[PDB]
Amino acid sequence: MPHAFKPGDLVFAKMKGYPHWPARIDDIADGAVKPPPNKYPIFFFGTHETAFLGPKDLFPYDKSKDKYGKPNKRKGFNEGLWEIQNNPHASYS
Ligand SMILES: CCC(=O)NCc1nnc2n1CCCC2
Structure with missing residues (x-):
């Protein structure tokens, strides 16, 4: 059965006006703004x-x-498909 979402999980994420988009749940770095x-x-x-x-x-x-x-x-989408398939856990900073 499913767990709650945790950092590292891979998703398509939906926002108004955009197609379901390749994305990941991130961690929050020490000292960084919390959601x-x-x-x-x-x-x-x-x-x-x-x-x-x-x-x-x-x-x-x-x-x-x-x-x-x-x-x-859409701008960035196909690069995003490559990232989620090929190196979803990399640093993209
Ligand atoms: C999230 C930041 C934002 O509002 N910028 C617009 C925007 N441009 N490509 C994307 N987004 C949103 C989410 C899908 C990827």
């Missing part, structure tokens, strides 16, 4: 941006990749 309650820090592959999202917008990657993991015209 609001009930929100997770989501690192978006390709764009390398971070937003705070709750589980309603987080789709586990294994289950969802058949539907959401196809090339898209």
Whole structure:
């Protein structure tokens, strides 16, 4: 059965106006800004941006990749597909 989300989990993450996007749950570094309650820090592959999202917008990657993991015209998306498949746990700073 499923656990709660934890840092390192791979997802497609949904935000208003964008396609379901390759992303990971991030850790919060010591001394860095924490997310609001009930929100997770989501690192978006390709764009390398971070937003705070709750589980309603987080789709586990294994289950969802058949539907959401196809090339898209949006800036950063196809780079993001490469990252989530080939080196999802790397430093992208
Ligand atoms: C998250 C930061 C933001 O609002 N910038 C717009 C934006 N541009 N590409 C993306 N995003 C959002 C999430 C999918 C990747």
